[PDB]
Amino acid sequence: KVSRDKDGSKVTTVVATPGQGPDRPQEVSYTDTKVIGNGSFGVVYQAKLCDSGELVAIKKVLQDKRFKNRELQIMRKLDHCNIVRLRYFFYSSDEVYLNLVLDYVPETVYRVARHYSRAKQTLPVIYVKLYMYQLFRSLAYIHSFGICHRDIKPQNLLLDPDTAVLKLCDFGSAKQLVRGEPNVSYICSRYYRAPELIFGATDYTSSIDVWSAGCVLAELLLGQPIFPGDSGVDQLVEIIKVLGTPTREQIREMNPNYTEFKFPQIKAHPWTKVFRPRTPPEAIALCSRLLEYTPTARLTPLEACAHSFFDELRDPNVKLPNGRDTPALFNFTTQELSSNPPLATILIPPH
Amino acid sequence: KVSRDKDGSKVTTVVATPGQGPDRPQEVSYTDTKVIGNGSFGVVYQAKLCDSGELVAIKKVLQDKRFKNRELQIMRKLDHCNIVRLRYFFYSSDEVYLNLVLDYVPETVYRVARHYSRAKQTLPVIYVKLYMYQLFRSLAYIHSFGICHRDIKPQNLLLDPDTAVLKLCDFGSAKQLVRGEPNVSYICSRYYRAPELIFGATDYTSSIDVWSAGCVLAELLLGQPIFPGDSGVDQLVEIIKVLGTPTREQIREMNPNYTEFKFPQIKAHPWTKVFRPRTPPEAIALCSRLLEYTPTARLTPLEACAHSFFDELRDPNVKLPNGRDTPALFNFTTQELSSNPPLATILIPPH
Ligand SMILES: c1cncc(-c2nc3ccc4ncc(N5CCSCC5)nc4c3o2)c1
Ligand SMILES: c1cncc(-c2nc3ccc4ncc(N5CCSCC5)nc4c3o2)c1
């Protein structure tokens, strides 16, 4: 159903299932359609809902009729203030496309960082704390369902510049990780790719996401990627140039069925001397606890939220630089705290 | 067959079909096996052939029994001094892997450029001429067969630093283009991706490779990528920021069935002000003739070989900076010249 309204604007009307809530298809109309993204899957559009005037992002992906879509399945489960909301899904055009209608968010962490980096400046630490904290919250939430994003990178961190609200997006790499069931090794954007994946692990856990979050924190502190690999395995060289050569124990912790990379012995660089001189030590300390070789040695998302780097966010007096209140930071559900309930005492300040 | 030699070394023995020459499988033994690369396809190994002591790269790709492998088919046709030679292929271990045994080449153009850029210098122009000339030769060769590489980027330009010999590698994206038969639009590493592909063209030609080669030339002159997109469509913004907004004629030349990107009108940037002040004009001029929006307006690889930027390579007196002779540059076959035979009078100096 494509029509023209009062003036002469192109209105598209589709039958779409609500993203969350009852499985009751309804007519949804939108206009002002334009391409804002693309990839192996297909295209991302900006559009405006006719009823409410609200901007949405529509991800359009080729669908194997017989094959069930993993991304749709995951997006239908999720309901969290730091994950972009699936509003609706619908099918369109001898092949069929799934269309995911999402809340539109006008910026990304990547673009905000590039603005600073292109001017050889760094993001003020308060922005770093707000973004990194909300990402760790989204990760606690999805990891509590056994769901691993597997593509944490600055481009998939949407933000409202005015409220400083962050939304995790692009669940196209996401998977429910099940003990015993192998996972693909070539996964995640290279710079953010956990060392176990480079060692070809198929038995990895949700902790590959914490490594990625570590790479994002480090990038925001440095003003450039901490591990800029030219390839999958040169990525490992770059990591070793900072963390040093991993021990046989660490390598076994990463992939117990690995083959020979036979790279030379390099000593670790001191963490503090990786970052610029005035970098806050609590920031550097959090980085060291995220970017551990041994996956089980990495802080959990909930633990990362409790780190002293975020202490400033739990100040009753804290405000955004633009003067407005901080967004919702402390309204933790049961599900969010499920990994370690007692952490609440730290994660929820007195008043 | 995995065995131990005179000393106690791990020798692997496989039955492999010669890359070129008769379909006659023979025993091939190799040792000193190590991972040098990986990707969606699988893993790349270094190994040493036991008989000859020669270093090879072994690309190992998962093989669908029912599907015939496009990459193998193409590699078996190719025999050129600037394309990495398929020596052998063999199958290994309930799933089956194709192993492509290739000549080992110890550097890439990308790594050589990074060495200079990381020191805030540029590659001397003579290296730029040598690399770009050999790339255009490999492209003239494969394009003469209707074969398009579709992943031209500095990482896929292997070189022997001593002889300055360049070998095109990674034919994992390569395809014989047939008029009428659609090709995938999401293809090529983003920075090198021709504008028609971003407009979602499925009837592009081998000229997408010349656009990529232009992006490589520009990067070698600049010390960084000329079009650093954060995404598929932001790639187009970055291009427009230099070339300006394309005309409706150029857009139609790129994809006659395209959709709304609805981007702002931006005026072209002067070519000479993109590059550093002492950039040779013949280099900038060649770049302008490669990075044309209208695909048919792009120089052919053979035409690009005949450009005045390469005049220095046809000097009887020219030598490598290390003092050694220039490699074979002028031993063009008939097949190579097939796109425009008369260009020989320029391409093959009397000496
Ligand atoms: C590629 C693969 N998988 C998902 C996505 C995607 N999901 C969203 C949700 C919401 C979005 N809202 C806005 C937006 N833009 C405008 C702001 S700058 C990035 C593009 N982009 C969005 C987006 O992109 C993209
Ligand atoms: C990815 C996808 N498809 C193919 C390839 C590939 N083919 C070759 C051939 C020969 C090679 N020789 C050497 C080499 N190294 C050592 C030098 S630095 C890059 C890795 N790498 C090679 C290579 O990689 C990689």
Side-chain angles (χ1 to χ4, degrees), chain A residues 2-5 7-93 95-351, chain B residues 2-3 8-93 95-351:
Chain A
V2 168
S3 65
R4 312 256 171 205
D5 76 63
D7 59 357
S9 323
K10 185 192 143 141
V11 175
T12 309
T13 306
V14 306
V15 180
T17 308
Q20 58 184 48
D23 203 61
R24 234 208 300 280
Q26 53 173 97
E27 293 191 16
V28 184
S29 284
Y30 59 82
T31 193
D32 299 342
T33 279
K34 66 167 214 219
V35 173
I36 55 168
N38 65 5
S40 65
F41 51 88
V43 186
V44 181
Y45 301 87
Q46 191 188 316
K48 195 181 65 156
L49 300 188
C50 294
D51 290 336
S52 68
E54 271 146 18
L55 295 184
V56 292
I58 309 175
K59 186 177 175 173
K60 179 184 207 182
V61 313
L62 186 87
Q63 185 62 72
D64 288 21
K65 294 158 152 299
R66 289 191 283 180
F67 214 56
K68 248 75 168 285
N69 186 280
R70 173 182 295 169
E71 186 176 14
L72 174 56
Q73 191 171 39
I74 282 155
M75 291 297 287
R76 292 185 85 178
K77 296 198 202 104
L78 304 186
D79 174 16
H80 191 282
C81 56
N82 304 123
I83 302 174
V84 73
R85 189 183 38 170
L86 189 67
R87 280 161 161 282
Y88 307 102
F89 64 99
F90 66 91
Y91 297 92
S92 53
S93 299
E95 268 290 322
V96 302
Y97 293 75
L98 172 64
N99 298 260
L100 304 180
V101 182
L102 308 144
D103 284 342
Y104 180 90
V105 195
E107 277 309 330
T108 71
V109 163
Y110 175 77
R111 311 220 297 163
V112 160
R114 183 172 64 180
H115 280 311
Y116 277 81
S117 181
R118 274 202 290 234
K120 316 300 130 65
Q121 308 182 53
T122 47
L123 213 40
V125 64
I126 189 54
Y127 296 111
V128 176
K129 292 178 194 203
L130 289 158
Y131 305 163
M132 281 315 301
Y133 175 96
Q134 287 176 91
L135 161 60
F136 280 127
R137 258 196 104 182
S138 68
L139 285 188
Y141 177 70
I142 62 155
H143 290 177
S144 75
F145 289 114
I147 294 181
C148 189
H149 186 279
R150 304 202 299 178
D151 196 27
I152 299 298
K153 70 186 196 155
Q155 287 96 323
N156 295 338
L157 311 181
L158 298 167
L159 65 93
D160 193 28
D162 282 342
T163 64
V165 167
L166 178 144
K167 315 274 189 202
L168 186 50
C169 80
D170 187 357
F171 286 76
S173 299
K175 193 206 190 144
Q176 192 188 303
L177 300 189
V178 186
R179 287 196 296 282
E181 305 200 356
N183 310 294
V184 68
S185 64
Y186 207 72
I187 198 64
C188 204
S189 185
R190 180 191 300 145
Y191 292 169
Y192 310 92
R193 187 180 296 137
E196 50 260 45
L197 293 170
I198 306 184
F199 277 98
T202 60
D203 82 338
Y204 52 92
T205 79
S206 74
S207 78
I208 63 149
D209 279 347
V210 171
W211 172 279
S212 301
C215 297
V216 178
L217 172 58
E219 182 163 344
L220 290 177
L221 296 175
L222 282 166
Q224 64 183 94
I226 188 164
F227 307 128
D230 75 359
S231 72
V233 310
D234 176 61
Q235 189 55 29
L236 187 55
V237 177
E238 288 298 323
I239 297 176
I240 289 171
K241 268 165 61 169
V242 180
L243 288 192
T245 299
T247 62
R248 289 192 175 156
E249 172 73 306
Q250 285 167 323
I251 289 172
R252 286 183 191 188
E253 297 268 19
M254 281 188 292
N255 187 21
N257 297 100
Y258 81 109
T259 199
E260 312 301 341
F261 281 77
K262 302 192 177 156
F263 267 113
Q265 176 69 56
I266 299 290
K267 309 281 188 224
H269 207 256
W271 259 116
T272 304
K273 289 212 271 183
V274 169
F275 299 108
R276 290 166 186 188
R278 288 180 186 174
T279 312
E282 52 279 21
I284 298 164
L286 173 59
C287 281
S288 68
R289 295 293 285 111
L290 298 173
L291 300 172
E292 293 278 352
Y293 276 125
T294 297
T296 48
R298 295 168 200 167
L299 289 190
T300 71
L302 205 42
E303 281 167 8
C305 281
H307 195 278
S308 54
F309 173 60
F310 297 118
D311 279 348
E312 179 176 0
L313 290 192
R314 292 178 271 272
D315 188 338
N317 289 324
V318 72
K319 305 292 174 172
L320 307 187
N322 71 9
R324 281 149 82 141
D325 288 315
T326 64
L329 287 180
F330 314 119
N331 59 352
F332 284 98
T333 67
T334 296
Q335 183 83 4
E336 288 189 271
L337 300 180
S338 61
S339 81
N340 202 317
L343 278 183
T345 312
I346 294 186
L347 289 173
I348 302 179
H351 296 267
Chain B
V2 169
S3 66
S9 320
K10 184 175 185 173
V11 173
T12 308
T13 306
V14 304
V15 175
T17 307
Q20 61 193 55
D23 204 61
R24 196 142 48 203
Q26 52 173 99
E27 296 188 351
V28 178
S29 282
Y30 59 82
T31 197
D32 300 344
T33 285
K34 65 202 72 173
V35 172
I36 54 167
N38 62 8
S40 65
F41 52 87
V43 187
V44 186
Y45 303 88
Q46 196 167 354
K48 196 168 56 149
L49 304 181
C50 293
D51 60 344
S52 69
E54 271 150 12
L55 291 178
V56 292
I58 309 179
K59 184 181 175 175
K60 181 183 208 190
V61 312
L62 180 135
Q63 186 62 72
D64 286 11
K65 289 187 183 168
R66 297 164 72 184
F67 216 56
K68 297 176 177 169
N69 183 282
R70 176 180 294 167
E71 188 177 11
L72 175 55
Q73 192 180 313
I74 284 156
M75 294 294 299
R76 290 184 88 180
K77 296 197 213 104
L78 303 185
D79 181 12
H80 191 280
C81 52
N82 304 120
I83 306 178
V84 73
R85 186 182 45 173
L86 190 68
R87 280 163 159 283
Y88 308 103
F89 62 100
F90 66 90
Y91 298 91
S92 52
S93 318
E95 267 258 20
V96 173
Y97 293 94
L98 172 64
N99 299 261
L100 304 184
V101 186
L102 308 144
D103 285 342
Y104 180 80
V105 195
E107 276 303 352
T108 72
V109 166
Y110 180 73
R111 292 183 45 195
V112 160
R114 175 166 61 171
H115 282 310
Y116 277 90
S117 75
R118 277 215 281 238
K120 320 298 131 62
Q121 295 180 31
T122 42
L123 210 42
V125 62
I126 187 53
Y127 297 113
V128 175
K129 295 178 195 199
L130 283 159
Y131 303 163
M132 282 314 299
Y133 177 95
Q134 289 177 95
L135 164 57
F136 279 126
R137 253 200 105 181
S138 60
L139 284 189
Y141 178 69
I142 60 155
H143 290 177
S144 76
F145 287 113
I147 296 184
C148 188
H149 186 279
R150 304 202 300 177
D151 196 26
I152 296 297
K153 68 187 198 144
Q155 287 94 328
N156 292 339
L157 314 181
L158 298 167
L159 64 91
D160 194 25
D162 287 341
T163 66
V165 168
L166 177 146
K167 313 276 191 201
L168 182 53
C169 76
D170 188 356
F171 285 74
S173 292
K175 192 183 166 171
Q176 192 153 97
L177 296 190
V178 183
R179 295 181 64 194
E181 301 194 353
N183 311 293
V184 68
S185 67
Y186 209 71
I187 198 64
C188 293
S189 187
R190 181 190 301 144
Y191 294 166
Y192 312 92
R193 184 179 302 138
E196 51 262 45
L197 294 168
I198 300 178
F199 278 97
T202 59
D203 178 36
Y204 51 93
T205 79
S206 74
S207 78
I208 61 145
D209 277 348
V210 173
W211 173 279
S212 301
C215 293
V216 176
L217 173 55
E219 181 165 349
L220 290 181
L221 297 174
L222 282 167
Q224 68 189 47
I226 187 176
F227 308 127
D230 75 359
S231 72
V233 310
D234 177 60
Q235 189 55 29
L236 188 53
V237 177
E238 286 296 325
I239 297 174
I240 289 171
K241 277 176 187 171
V242 178
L243 291 190
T245 298
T247 65
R248 299 188 154 182
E249 172 73 300
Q250 288 169 324
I251 293 171
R252 284 180 184 188
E253 290 273 342
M254 281 188 296
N255 188 19
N257 294 101
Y258 80 109
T259 199
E260 319 276 26
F261 282 80
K262 303 191 182 175
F263 287 157
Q265 176 68 56
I266 302 288
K267 302 289 144 57
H269 208 255
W271 256 126
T272 294
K273 286 208 274 194
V274 169
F275 296 109
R276 91 194 174 283
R278 260 99 176 200
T279 311
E282 294 88 354
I284 295 166
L286 173 59
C287 206
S288 69
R289 295 291 283 111
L290 300 171
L291 299 173
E292 306 262 18
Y293 277 123
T294 297
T296 45
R298 296 171 197 163
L299 288 189
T300 72
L302 200 45
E303 283 174 351
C305 278
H307 195 276
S308 53
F309 172 61
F310 298 119
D311 278 348
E312 181 181 356
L313 290 188
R314 296 179 270 273
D315 187 340
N317 287 324
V318 73
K319 307 289 175 173
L320 303 191
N322 71 9
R324 279 147 84 143
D325 290 317
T326 64
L329 288 177
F330 313 120
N331 58 354
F332 286 96
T333 66
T334 289
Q335 180 85 0
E336 288 189 86
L337 300 179
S338 60
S339 85
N340 201 327
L343 280 183
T345 311
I346 291 185
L347 287 175
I348 308 177
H351 73 97

